[PDB]
Amino acid sequence: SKYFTTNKKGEIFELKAELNNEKKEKRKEAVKKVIAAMTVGKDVSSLFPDVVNCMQTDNLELKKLVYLYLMNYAKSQPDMAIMAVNSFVKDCEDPNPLIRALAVRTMGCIRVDKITEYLCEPLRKCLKDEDPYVRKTAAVCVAKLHDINAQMVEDQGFLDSLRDLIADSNPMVVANAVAALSEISESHPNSNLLDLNPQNINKLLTALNECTEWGQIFILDCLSNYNPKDDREAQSICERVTPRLSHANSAVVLSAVKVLMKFLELLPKDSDYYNMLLKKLAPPLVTLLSGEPEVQYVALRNINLIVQKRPEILKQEIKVFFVKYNDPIYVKLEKLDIMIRLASQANIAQVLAELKEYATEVDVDFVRKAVRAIGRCAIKVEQSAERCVSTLLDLIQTKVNYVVQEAIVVIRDIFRKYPNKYESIIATLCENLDSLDEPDARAAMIWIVGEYAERIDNADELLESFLEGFHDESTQVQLTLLTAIVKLFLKKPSETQELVQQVLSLATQDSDNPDLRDRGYIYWRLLSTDPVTAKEVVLEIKPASLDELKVSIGNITLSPA
Amino acid sequence: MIGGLFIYNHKGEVLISRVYRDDIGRNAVDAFRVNVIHARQQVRSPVTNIARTSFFHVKRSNIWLAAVTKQNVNAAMVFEFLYKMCDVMAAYFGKISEENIKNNFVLIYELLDEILDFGYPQNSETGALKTFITQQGIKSQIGWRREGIKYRRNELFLDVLESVNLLMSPQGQVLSAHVSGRVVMKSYLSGMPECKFGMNDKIVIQSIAIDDCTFHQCVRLSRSISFIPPDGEFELMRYRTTKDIILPFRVIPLVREVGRTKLEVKVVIKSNFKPSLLAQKIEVRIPTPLNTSGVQVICMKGKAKYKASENAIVWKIKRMAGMKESQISAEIELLPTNDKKKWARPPISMNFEVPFAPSGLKVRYLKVFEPKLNYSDHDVIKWVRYIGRSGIYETRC
Amino acid sequence: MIRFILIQNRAGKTRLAKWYMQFDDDEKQKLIEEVHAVVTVRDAKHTNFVEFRNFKIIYRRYAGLYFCICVDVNDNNLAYLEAIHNFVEVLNEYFHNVCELDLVFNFYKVYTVVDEMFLAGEIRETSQTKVLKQLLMLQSLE
Amino acid sequence: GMRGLAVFISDIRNCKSKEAEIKRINKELANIRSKFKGDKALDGYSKKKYVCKLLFIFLLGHDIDFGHMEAVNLLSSNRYTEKQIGYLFISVLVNSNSELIRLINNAIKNDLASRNPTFMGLALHCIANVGSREMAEAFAGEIPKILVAGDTMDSVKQSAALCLLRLYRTSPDLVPMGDWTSRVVHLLNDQHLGVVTAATSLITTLAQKNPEEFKTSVSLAVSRLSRIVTSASTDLQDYTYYFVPAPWLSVKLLRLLQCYPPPEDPAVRGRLTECLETILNKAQEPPKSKKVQHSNAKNAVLFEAISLIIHHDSEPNLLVRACNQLGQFLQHRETNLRYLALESMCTLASSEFSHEAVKTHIETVINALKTERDVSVRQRAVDLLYAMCDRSNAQQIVAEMLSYLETADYSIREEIVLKVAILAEKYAVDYTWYVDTILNLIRIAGDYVSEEVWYRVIQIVINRDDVQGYAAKTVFEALQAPACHENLVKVGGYILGEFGNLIAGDPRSSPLIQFNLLHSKFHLCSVPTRALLLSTYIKFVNLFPEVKATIQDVLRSDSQLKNADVELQQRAVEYLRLSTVASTDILATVLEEMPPFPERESSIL
Ligand SMILES: O=P(O)(O)O[C@H]1[C@H](OP(=O)(O)O)[C@@H](OP(=O)(O)O)[C@@H](OP(=O)(O)O)[C@H](OP(=O)(O)O)[C@H]1OP(=O)(O)O
C-alpha cells in the first residue's frame, strides 16, 4: 500500500511545519530545503499549497525562491504549475521590475492550454513597461507564446509589438527582438519580416556597436539571411561590420565573417574594396585560435570551409595553424586539414618539416594522419613530390613499425601519380618486408612489385612469399596479389608460369568470396581467349614474341587439391 | 536555441538540469550519457549530432556541462555561453566540482532563469547580475637517477600493457568487468630530462575491482603528470578501471540438451573493434560434461579439438580483424544414468592479444626537456606500443 | 543464501546495510554504488529480479526507498520479494506508519528487526505477530 | 532513547555542505575521545550513547580508530540496551586485536551460560553475524548442545540453528555429525513453525555433504508440507500471509526435498504426489485477494514445487500439469510471472516427459513475444522458441522471427538474426525456402548478417537454376526501397549482374532501371561494395548492349578512373578497356555465367 508515504511524520511533515512558521527566516530555509529536494527527485508534491502560501510576502528573496520552485514544475509538470495563475497576473502589476519580468518568464515556460486566457493582457503591459529588463523579458516571451497553440491574429499584433521593440533605447531589447523574431520567422508561413528595413538594418548596425555581446550574435545572424540587390547596398553594410574583429571572442567574429563572405561575392569582385576586406579578415580569424580549446574547433571548421572558397585570404598566415603537443586531437586534425589546403610552393619548406615533427611523436593516431597528410602535400603540388619522398624514407629508417607501414602506403599513392620516376627506392623499401602486419601496407608492397615487376629480377620470390598463407590474408591483399601475379605473368611469361597457377586456382577453386572467384575467372578467361587483348586491358601506357605466352597458358590448369 | 542544460558527475549522474523546449525529454539526458559520457570506443569531439538533436559539452574537473538543441544553431555561441556560465558559477563558489554544485543547487537554479531565457544567452556577466540574484554561493575549504648519463641517441619506449576481465551472462549482460593496466617506460635519455606526459581522461586519480591509480615515486601532479625518469626500464603508473571498458570479443553460446543422450553446442564469437586492427593468439575454451562419449567438432575459421583430460573443446584462431564473426559447432554424446541432478555448467573462457588498451587509455604526448645538454624533444626517437591481453574473460552458458 | 540486504534512497544514501559475506570496506562501498546504479534506472514495468555480478538482486521501491536482497542465482525470487514486503510490514507496525527518518534516528533498532527476521543468510522468522511481540518486549527492557 | 544521539544526527542533517558535515563529525569524535580518556568515568547511558555515535559515524563512511574497548565493556552490562549497542558495534566493526577476541569470547560465554534467552540470543547472533575462527573454536561444541537441549526456548533454538549453520559454512571441521544429527531432524515436528523454518535451512545445507545422516528428514518434510498446504483459514493464523499458509516454510521444505531422490517408501511418495497436486490445484483457483502479495506468496510455492517436480523427473503427470500452468502465466499482467514462466519452460523443454508439452505453447510464446515490452522477457521468449524448435516448428518459428524483425527494436536483432541463420541451415526443407529466408534476413537485418552466411546464399543461387528468378525479383524488389542494408547491395548487385537477364523482360525492371538503381546505391557504399558493383556493371555491358553507353560514362568519370582506391581505379580501367579493346564475341566468354561451385561437404546437402 502507502508504506513509507505518511504525511503525519518524517521529512515532509517537518517541512510543511517550517513552511508555516511565522518567522519568515525559517520559511526561506524551508523553500530551499524543498528546492534542494526536487533536484534529488523527492515527492515534494504534498507541499505545493504551503510553498505557494510563502508568496504572501513583501520579501524579495522569499518570493523569488517560491518562483524557482514553480519553474522546476513548469518544465517537468506543466499541469502542476497552472494552479498558481492568479499570482503571475498580479505579480506583473507589482511595483518592482525584478518581480514583473519574473511573472512573465514563468507564465511563458508553462506549456499547456488554458495559459492563453491569463497571459495575453499582462504581456501588453510589459512590452510598453517603464523598465528594459521587463521589455527584454516580454520580447523573449512573445517567442514562448508563438511556440504554444494558435498562431493568434493578436500575436500578429505582437509581431508589430516585436518590430516596434527593434526601435528602442536599449539594444538588449533590440537584441532579444531580433532573436525572438527570426525564431518565430522560421515557423508557419514564410516571408514575415522582410520590411523596407534600411532603417531596420540601420538600428541593427548601430545596435551592433554598443550592444551586450550576445545581442550582436543574434543580429549578425539575421543580417546573414538577407540578399542585397546592388553593390553599394551590400558594400556599406560590410563597412559598419568592420569593427566586429574582437567582441565576444568567437561568437561574433564568426557571425561577422559569415556575413562578410555572403556580401563579398555580391561585391563586384572589383579589387577596389574587395581587396581591403580580404586583408582585414586574416587577423581576426587567427585570434580565435588561441581562446578555449573547444571554440578553436568550431573556428577551424568554418575556416576550412572559408579556405575551400578563398584560399588566398590566409595564404599569408599558414604559420598560425601548425600543431602544439597539448592540443586536443580534434583540434590537431582540423589544423592538419587546413595546413594541407594552404600548401603553396613557398611554405612546403616549413610545412613538410612540421609534418615530420608530428610523425615522430607518441600519439599513434595523429602520427598516422600526419604521414598520410604528407601524401596530400605531394598529390596537391608536383614540385615538392621529391622533398616529400625524402621525409617518408627518413621515417622508414627510424624503424617505428606503424610509421613504416603508413609511409610505405603513401609512397604507393605517389608512384601512382608520379610514375617511372621514383624507382631506386623499391630495393630500399623491401629491406622492411619481414614486419608488415597491417593488411593495407601489405597490398601497397604487393602492387609496387605489380608495376615494376621488370625493374626487379627479385619480384618472382616475393609474390610467392605472400601466396604461402593466401587465406588468413585480407581479401584486399588476395585481390592486390591476384592483379599483381597476373601482372608479373603479362611481363615475364615463362619463369612466372609457376605463380599464375595457384593464385588463379585459389581464386576460382579454393575461396568462397564470389567477388574474388569472379576476378580469378575474369582473368583466367582473359589469358585463355587471346593473351593480346589481356595485355591491353591489364597494363596502361608509359611515362612479336607471344609464343612464350601461348606455350605457358596451354601448360597451366587450375585445381583445389 | 539551447533547448536544454544538464550537469553530470564523473558517474554520469545528472546533478542539476533545466529543459527549455519540449524536444528534450527523457530522450535527451540519456543520449548524451550513452553516446558521450559512457562513449567506449569513440575518440569524441565537443559537438555530437545524435538523430536530429545536437550536443555541446565542456568538461570541468569531474563535471560534464552539456547543452542540447534539437535545431542546429550558432555552434560558437552555445560554447561561448557555457564558458561564461562556468565564469558566473566560479565567481560565487570557486572550483566547478561535484561538491560545490551540490552545496549550490538553489543558487544555480537562480542563475539559469537569468543567464538563459528560452535558450537565449542573456547578461551573463557578474556586475550586471548582483541585482537579479538573491542567493549567495557556499565556497568550502635526485634518488633514482645517476648524475652524468649520456647516449649518442636519446630514445624512449612506452608500453601500455592491459589485462581485461569479463563475466557475461548467456544473454550477453556484462555481470562484472575490470581492466588491470600499467605503462612501462624504457628511457635512454642523456642528462636529467624533465618529462611532461599527457593521456585521455579514462584513468581517474570473489573480489570486487575498485578503480585506483599508483605512480612511480618520481611523478609530480598537476591534466598531465611530469617527472625525471629513472634510466632504462621502469613502471610509470599501475591502475585498474571498471567503467566504460572496450570488450574486444562477445561470445554468444547456443547450448541445447537434446534429452540426456546428445548435447548440441554452437558458439559464435564476434570481434567488436576497428576493422583495420587484428587480435592474435585467439583461443576459445568450451567446457564438456565429465561423462562424454565421442565429440564431432566442425569450425570454418581456425582449428579445434576435444581435450578429454582437460574436459573441454579448445578452438584456436591465429588472427581475426574487427567487425568479423566466426562459428564452431559441436555434437557431444553422453552415457548417463548417474545422479538425478544434471551438469552445472562452467563458463566459456577466451585468450587473445589486441593492439589497443581495453580501458581506452591513449598516450597523447610526452615532452622531454633537458636544461643543460644540447638536445630537445624534436631530437628524441619515440616508439609507443599497445598490448591488450585477455585476463579471466568468462561467458556463462 | 542471502549475501547482503540494502535499504537505499533515490539519492543513493544507504539507510541499512547487512552483510552475510566477507567484504573489505572498499568492496562494500563499490557494491552499494553498483546496486544503486542497477535499480534506480528501472521503471515500474521491469522485473523485481536482476542478475548482479555472480549473484542476483531482488528489489521493490516503497516511496523514496529501495529495499534490496542480494541472493544466490538458484534462490526463489518470489519468496525473497515477499520476504521484503513482510519485513516492511513489520517495520511499518513497530514504527507506527514508518518514514525514512525513523530508519535514521533508530538505525540501531532496525538492526534488531533484521536479525529477528533474517540471520546467517537465511529467513529466520516470518510471523509478523511473533516478531512484533518480541520487538515490543525488547523495547521495554532497561 | 538518547537525546544526545538525535542532536548529533539532526545537526548532521542541517549541514549545508560536506565541509560542515566533516567539521560536525570531528567535533563529535573529539568529545567522545575526550570522555573515554577523561578523568571522571561515564555512567552506562554515556558509554552506550557515544559507542552508538561511533557506529553511526562509521556508517556515514569515516574511519573509527578507537572505542572498541568501550563497546566490549557494555557486553558485561546487565542492562539489555547496553549489551545490544555493544554487541552491534563489534558485529559491524570486526578488529583483529587478540586481547579483544579473548574478552569478547568471555562476554559471549557469560551470556550463553546465563539461562536468559534475550542475553543468549545476542551472543548467538554475534556469533552468526561475525563467524570468526576463534568464535567457532570457542563455541562450535556448545551450539549443538543448546539446539537439542529440551529446556532451551524456541527463539533460542531458531537463533542457535542458524548460528550452527553459519558455523558449518565458515568452519565445517568444527561441526562433525555427532549425537545431535537425529534430534535436529526431530525439530521438523515442532509446534513452532519458526523453529521448523530454521531447522530446515540447517538440515538442507547439512544434507548436501552428509545426505545419508539426514535421510529421515524426507518423511517428516512431506508430513509437514502436506499438513500445511491442506490446512484451513483458522489453522496457522500466525504463519498465514495474504491467505497463503506458511509460504516461506513450504518453499524451504520443497527445497530440502531437492537434496534427495523421490521417497523410497511408497506411502510417502504418495503423500508427496497428493501434496504437489494440491499446490498445482491452488494455481487454478482464482485470487482470494486482488493484492499482488497473495499471488506472489502462492506462486513462490508453485515455482518451488515445479523445481522439485523437474528435479525428481519421475512423475510425468506433474511435469505436464506444470507446463500447462506455466503456459497460462505467459498471458499475465505481472512481468515477473511472465519472466519465471519462460525460464521454467526452457528447462522442461530438455526433459522428454515434457518436451512435447512445451511445443503445445508455441502459440502463446510467439504471441507473448509480439506484445512483450520488458527486453529480458523477450530474450527468454526467443530462447524458448530456440529450445522447442524441430523439423515440425522450424518454418513457423523462422517465419515468426522474420516477422518480429520487421518492426523489432535494435536491442534484440543481433541474437534473433543469429538464431534465424542457424535454424535455416539445420532445418532446410529445400533450397528455395533457405534462399527465401536468407534474402529476407539480409533485406531486413543485413547489418547483423555474417559474411560466411551471405557467401553461402550466393553459392546456392548459382548452383540451382530453379531459384535464380526468385532470387533476382526478391533482391530487385528489396533493392528499390528508399534505404537498404549494404549487405543487400552486395547480394543484390552480385545476383542481378549474374541473373538480372531473367527479370530484364519486365519494363518494371529494365537494364537501365536495374543499373540506375544499383548506381543510386554506389556513391553511398563501401569500397569492396563499389568494386563488386563495377564487376556487375561490366557483366551488364555484356548482357544488355542497350546501356553500354551510360555504363561507359560512369567508368570514364574521374571519380571512378582516378580513384584513391586501387581495386576501384584498376577495375574501372580494366572494365573500360574491356568494353572497348574487345569485340562482342570475346567479351561474351570473358563474362559468361560463372561455373557452379565445387560442392564439398562443409555445407549442402
Ligand atoms: O543530551 P544528553 O544525551 O543527556 O547528553 C548531554 C550532552 O552530551 P553529548 O552532546 O556529548 O552527547 C552534552 O550537552 P550538549 O553537548 O548536547 O549541549 C552535555 O555534556 P557537556 O556539556 O559536559 O559537554 C551534557 O552534560 P551536562 O550535564 O554537563 O550538560 C549531557 O547531558 P547529561 O550529562 O545530563 O547526560
PDB file of C-alpha atoms in Angstrom, chain D residues 157-322:
ATOM      1  CA  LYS D 157      16.558 -22.817  19.188  1.00  0.00           C
ATOM      2  CA  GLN D 158      15.912 -20.756  15.973  1.00  0.00           C
ATOM      3  CA  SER D 159      18.941 -18.489  16.593  1.00  0.00           C
ATOM      4  CA  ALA D 160      21.132 -21.492  17.648  1.00  0.00           C
ATOM      5  CA  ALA D 161      20.185 -23.424  14.445  1.00  0.00           C
ATOM      6  CA  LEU D 162      21.161 -20.597  12.062  1.00  0.00           C
ATOM      7  CA  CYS D 163      24.310 -19.870  14.179  1.00  0.00           C
ATOM      8  CA  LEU D 164      25.299 -23.576  13.821  1.00  0.00           C
ATOM      9  CA  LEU D 165      24.544 -23.132  10.030  1.00  0.00           C
ATOM     10  CA  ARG D 166      26.951 -20.116   9.748  1.00  0.00           C
ATOM     11  CA  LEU D 167      29.473 -22.234  11.776  1.00  0.00           C
ATOM     12  CA  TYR D 168      29.236 -25.230   9.300  1.00  0.00           C
ATOM     13  CA  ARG D 169      29.773 -22.929   6.241  1.00  0.00           C
ATOM     14  CA  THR D 170      32.700 -20.854   7.702  1.00  0.00           C
ATOM     15  CA  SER D 171      34.319 -23.704   9.793  1.00  0.00           C
ATOM     16  CA  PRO D 172      32.977 -27.182   8.810  1.00  0.00           C
ATOM     17  CA  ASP D 173      35.747 -29.188  10.619  1.00  0.00           C
ATOM     18  CA  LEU D 174      34.378 -27.783  13.936  1.00  0.00           C
ATOM     19  CA  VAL D 175      30.883 -29.303  13.102  1.00  0.00           C
ATOM     20  CA  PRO D 176      31.123 -33.136  12.868  1.00  0.00           C
ATOM     21  CA  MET D 177      27.968 -35.378  12.604  1.00  0.00           C
ATOM     22  CA  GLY D 178      27.813 -36.323  16.344  1.00  0.00           C
ATOM     23  CA  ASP D 179      24.938 -37.303  18.710  1.00  0.00           C
ATOM     24  CA  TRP D 180      22.549 -34.443  17.699  1.00  0.00           C
ATOM     25  CA  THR D 181      22.001 -35.374  13.977  1.00  0.00           C
ATOM     26  CA  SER D 182      18.614 -37.073  14.661  1.00  0.00           C
ATOM     27  CA  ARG D 183      17.378 -34.575  17.319  1.00  0.00           C
ATOM     28  CA  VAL D 184      17.848 -31.708  14.773  1.00  0.00           C
ATOM     29  CA  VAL D 185      15.757 -33.846  12.325  1.00  0.00           C
ATOM     30  CA  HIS D 186      13.133 -34.161  15.180  1.00  0.00           C
ATOM     31  CA  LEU D 187      12.823 -30.334  15.250  1.00  0.00           C
ATOM     32  CA  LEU D 188      10.906 -30.687  11.883  1.00  0.00           C
ATOM     33  CA  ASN D 189       7.920 -31.801  14.084  1.00  0.00           C
ATOM     34  CA  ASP D 190       7.984 -28.772  16.486  1.00  0.00           C
ATOM     35  CA  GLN D 191       4.753 -26.840  17.272  1.00  0.00           C
ATOM     36  CA  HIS D 192       6.771 -23.615  16.412  1.00  0.00           C
ATOM     37  CA  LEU D 193       6.867 -23.128  12.588  1.00  0.00           C
ATOM     38  CA  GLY D 194       9.703 -20.548  13.138  1.00  0.00           C
ATOM     39  CA  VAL D 195      11.776 -23.399  14.679  1.00  0.00           C
ATOM     40  CA  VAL D 196      10.763 -25.715  11.746  1.00  0.00           C
ATOM     41  CA  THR D 197      11.829 -22.922   9.278  1.00  0.00           C
ATOM     42  CA  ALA D 198      15.307 -22.574  10.977  1.00  0.00           C
ATOM     43  CA  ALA D 199      15.966 -26.342  11.297  1.00  0.00           C
ATOM     44  CA  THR D 200      15.017 -26.819   7.537  1.00  0.00           C
ATOM     45  CA  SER D 201      17.669 -24.195   6.453  1.00  0.00           C
ATOM     46  CA  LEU D 202      20.264 -26.056   8.595  1.00  0.00           C
ATOM     47  CA  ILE D 203      19.364 -29.648   7.530  1.00  0.00           C
ATOM     48  CA  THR D 204      19.295 -28.568   3.819  1.00  0.00           C
ATOM     49  CA  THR D 205      22.943 -27.322   3.931  1.00  0.00           C
ATOM     50  CA  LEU D 206      24.000 -30.360   6.092  1.00  0.00           C
ATOM     51  CA  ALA D 207      22.134 -32.882   3.825  1.00  0.00           C
ATOM     52  CA  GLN D 208      24.312 -31.842   0.736  1.00  0.00           C
ATOM     53  CA  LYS D 209      27.665 -33.285   2.058  1.00  0.00           C
ATOM     54  CA  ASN D 210      26.027 -35.757   4.553  1.00  0.00           C
ATOM     55  CA  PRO D 211      22.822 -36.993   2.744  1.00  0.00           C
ATOM     56  CA  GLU D 212      22.854 -40.412   4.496  1.00  0.00           C
ATOM     57  CA  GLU D 213      22.816 -38.868   8.047  1.00  0.00           C
ATOM     58  CA  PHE D 214      19.572 -36.861   7.316  1.00  0.00           C
ATOM     59  CA  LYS D 215      17.622 -39.439   5.175  1.00  0.00           C
ATOM     60  CA  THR D 216      14.895 -39.449   7.986  1.00  0.00           C
ATOM     61  CA  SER D 217      14.177 -35.717   7.127  1.00  0.00           C
ATOM     62  CA  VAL D 218      12.406 -36.762   3.841  1.00  0.00           C
ATOM     63  CA  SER D 219       9.428 -38.355   5.631  1.00  0.00           C
ATOM     64  CA  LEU D 220       8.841 -35.517   8.230  1.00  0.00           C
ATOM     65  CA  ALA D 221       9.359 -32.891   5.458  1.00  0.00           C
ATOM     66  CA  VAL D 222       6.474 -34.457   3.410  1.00  0.00           C
ATOM     67  CA  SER D 223       4.237 -34.938   6.529  1.00  0.00           C
ATOM     68  CA  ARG D 224       4.616 -31.255   7.451  1.00  0.00           C
ATOM     69  CA  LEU D 225       4.381 -29.926   3.866  1.00  0.00           C
ATOM     70  CA  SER D 226       1.050 -31.808   3.355  1.00  0.00           C
ATOM     71  CA  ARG D 227      -0.360 -30.696   6.774  1.00  0.00           C
ATOM     72  CA  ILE D 228       0.438 -27.010   5.781  1.00  0.00           C
ATOM     73  CA  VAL D 229      -0.850 -26.853   2.104  1.00  0.00           C
ATOM     74  CA  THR D 230      -4.151 -28.641   3.151  1.00  0.00           C
ATOM     75  CA  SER D 231      -4.886 -26.527   6.336  1.00  0.00           C
ATOM     76  CA  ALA D 232      -7.991 -24.249   6.740  1.00  0.00           C
ATOM     77  CA  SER D 233      -8.429 -20.437   7.365  1.00  0.00           C
ATOM     78  CA  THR D 234      -8.240 -20.827  11.223  1.00  0.00           C
ATOM     79  CA  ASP D 235      -5.121 -23.146  11.058  1.00  0.00           C
ATOM     80  CA  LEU D 236      -1.634 -21.455  11.193  1.00  0.00           C
ATOM     81  CA  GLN D 237      -3.069 -17.909  11.691  1.00  0.00           C
ATOM     82  CA  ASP D 238       0.485 -16.808  12.961  1.00  0.00           C
ATOM     83  CA  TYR D 239       2.228 -18.086   9.719  1.00  0.00           C
ATOM     84  CA  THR D 240      -0.504 -17.079   7.228  1.00  0.00           C
ATOM     85  CA  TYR D 241       0.478 -14.295   4.757  1.00  0.00           C
ATOM     86  CA  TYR D 242      -2.258 -12.824   2.455  1.00  0.00           C
ATOM     87  CA  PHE D 243      -4.420 -16.010   2.721  1.00  0.00           C
ATOM     88  CA  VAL D 244      -1.431 -18.292   1.924  1.00  0.00           C
ATOM     89  CA  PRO D 245      -0.432 -20.827   4.600  1.00  0.00           C
ATOM     90  CA  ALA D 246       3.260 -20.815   5.654  1.00  0.00           C
ATOM     91  CA  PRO D 247       4.666 -19.836   2.219  1.00  0.00           C
ATOM     92  CA  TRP D 248       8.436 -19.434   3.200  1.00  0.00           C
ATOM     93  CA  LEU D 249       8.387 -22.788   5.135  1.00  0.00           C
ATOM     94  CA  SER D 250       6.518 -24.525   2.207  1.00  0.00           C
ATOM     95  CA  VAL D 251       9.368 -23.197  -0.057  1.00  0.00           C
ATOM     96  CA  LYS D 252      12.104 -24.290   2.421  1.00  0.00           C
ATOM     97  CA  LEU D 253      10.506 -27.822   2.771  1.00  0.00           C
ATOM     98  CA  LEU D 254      10.315 -28.317  -1.056  1.00  0.00           C
ATOM     99  CA  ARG D 255      13.974 -27.139  -1.299  1.00  0.00           C
ATOM    100  CA  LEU D 256      15.055 -29.698   1.420  1.00  0.00           C
ATOM    101  CA  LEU D 257      13.309 -32.428  -0.693  1.00  0.00           C
ATOM    102  CA  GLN D 258      15.566 -31.465  -3.742  1.00  0.00           C
ATOM    103  CA  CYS D 259      18.542 -32.847  -1.659  1.00  0.00           C
ATOM    104  CA  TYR D 260      17.096 -36.380  -2.113  1.00  0.00           C
ATOM    105  CA  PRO D 261      15.688 -38.687  -4.801  1.00  0.00           C
ATOM    106  CA  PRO D 262      11.930 -39.405  -4.728  1.00  0.00           C
ATOM    107  CA  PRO D 263      10.996 -41.049  -1.363  1.00  0.00           C
ATOM    108  CA  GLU D 264      11.943 -44.803  -1.071  1.00  0.00           C
ATOM    109  CA  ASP D 265       8.710 -45.644   0.941  1.00  0.00           C
ATOM    110  CA  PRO D 266       5.664 -45.553  -1.466  1.00  0.00           C
ATOM    111  CA  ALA D 267       3.196 -44.176   1.212  1.00  0.00           C
ATOM    112  CA  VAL D 268       5.482 -41.034   1.351  1.00  0.00           C
ATOM    113  CA  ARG D 269       5.928 -40.699  -2.486  1.00  0.00           C
ATOM    114  CA  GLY D 270       2.087 -40.883  -2.362  1.00  0.00           C
ATOM    115  CA  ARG D 271       1.677 -38.177   0.335  1.00  0.00           C
ATOM    116  CA  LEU D 272       4.161 -36.126  -1.766  1.00  0.00           C
ATOM    117  CA  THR D 273       2.129 -36.521  -5.056  1.00  0.00           C
ATOM    118  CA  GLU D 274      -1.170 -35.545  -3.234  1.00  0.00           C
ATOM    119  CA  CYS D 275       0.857 -32.591  -1.825  1.00  0.00           C
ATOM    120  CA  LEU D 276       2.096 -31.275  -5.241  1.00  0.00           C
ATOM    121  CA  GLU D 277      -1.350 -31.958  -6.854  1.00  0.00           C
ATOM    122  CA  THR D 278      -2.895 -29.699  -4.191  1.00  0.00           C
ATOM    123  CA  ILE D 279      -0.292 -26.956  -4.932  1.00  0.00           C
ATOM    124  CA  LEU D 280      -0.976 -27.135  -8.724  1.00  0.00           C
ATOM    125  CA  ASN D 281      -4.768 -27.168  -7.930  1.00  0.00           C
ATOM    126  CA  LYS D 282      -4.436 -23.874  -5.902  1.00  0.00           C
ATOM    127  CA  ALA D 283      -2.862 -22.355  -9.046  1.00  0.00           C
ATOM    128  CA  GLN D 284      -6.192 -22.927 -10.966  1.00  0.00           C
ATOM    129  CA  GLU D 285      -8.330 -21.346  -8.101  1.00  0.00           C
ATOM    130  CA  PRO D 286      -8.988 -17.583  -8.596  1.00  0.00           C
ATOM    131  CA  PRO D 287      -7.340 -14.978  -6.267  1.00  0.00           C
ATOM    132  CA  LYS D 288      -8.602 -14.871  -2.590  1.00  0.00           C
ATOM    133  CA  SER D 289      -7.322 -11.213  -2.698  1.00  0.00           C
ATOM    134  CA  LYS D 290      -6.604  -8.694  -5.545  1.00  0.00           C
ATOM    135  CA  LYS D 291      -3.397  -7.819  -3.506  1.00  0.00           C
ATOM    136  CA  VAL D 292      -0.320  -8.867  -5.588  1.00  0.00           C
ATOM    137  CA  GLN D 293       1.187 -10.204  -2.260  1.00  0.00           C
ATOM    138  CA  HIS D 294      -1.320 -13.152  -2.331  1.00  0.00           C
ATOM    139  CA  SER D 295      -0.405 -14.172  -5.958  1.00  0.00           C
ATOM    140  CA  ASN D 296       3.430 -13.914  -5.300  1.00  0.00           C
ATOM    141  CA  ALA D 297       3.228 -15.892  -1.985  1.00  0.00           C
ATOM    142  CA  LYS D 298       1.092 -18.603  -3.773  1.00  0.00           C
ATOM    143  CA  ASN D 299       3.408 -18.702  -6.815  1.00  0.00           C
ATOM    144  CA  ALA D 300       6.641 -18.752  -4.737  1.00  0.00           C
ATOM    145  CA  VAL D 301       5.333 -22.197  -3.556  1.00  0.00           C
ATOM    146  CA  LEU D 302       4.114 -23.251  -7.010  1.00  0.00           C
ATOM    147  CA  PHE D 303       7.570 -22.441  -8.513  1.00  0.00           C
ATOM    148  CA  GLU D 304       9.480 -24.379  -5.807  1.00  0.00           C
ATOM    149  CA  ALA D 305       7.122 -27.421  -6.312  1.00  0.00           C
ATOM    150  CA  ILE D 306       7.921 -27.126 -10.057  1.00  0.00           C
ATOM    151  CA  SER D 307      11.735 -27.242  -9.213  1.00  0.00           C
ATOM    152  CA  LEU D 308      11.074 -30.398  -7.138  1.00  0.00           C
ATOM    153  CA  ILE D 309       8.984 -31.971  -9.978  1.00  0.00           C
ATOM    154  CA  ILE D 310      11.686 -31.023 -12.585  1.00  0.00           C
ATOM    155  CA  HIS D 311      14.464 -32.462 -10.248  1.00  0.00           C
ATOM    156  CA  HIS D 312      12.579 -35.771  -9.496  1.00  0.00           C
ATOM    157  CA  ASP D 313      11.851 -36.002 -13.297  1.00  0.00           C
ATOM    158  CA  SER D 314       9.897 -39.160 -12.114  1.00  0.00           C
ATOM    159  CA  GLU D 315       6.090 -38.307 -12.412  1.00  0.00           C
ATOM    160  CA  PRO D 316       5.088 -37.362 -15.997  1.00  0.00           C
ATOM    161  CA  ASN D 317       1.532 -36.245 -14.978  1.00  0.00           C
ATOM    162  CA  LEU D 318       3.024 -33.453 -12.740  1.00  0.00           C
ATOM    163  CA  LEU D 319       5.534 -32.401 -15.474  1.00  0.00           C
ATOM    164  CA  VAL D 320       2.625 -31.844 -17.950  1.00  0.00           C
ATOM    165  CA  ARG D 321       0.426 -30.044 -15.357  1.00  0.00           C
ATOM    166  CA  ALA D 322       3.470 -27.871 -14.511  1.00  0.00           C
TER     167      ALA D 322
END
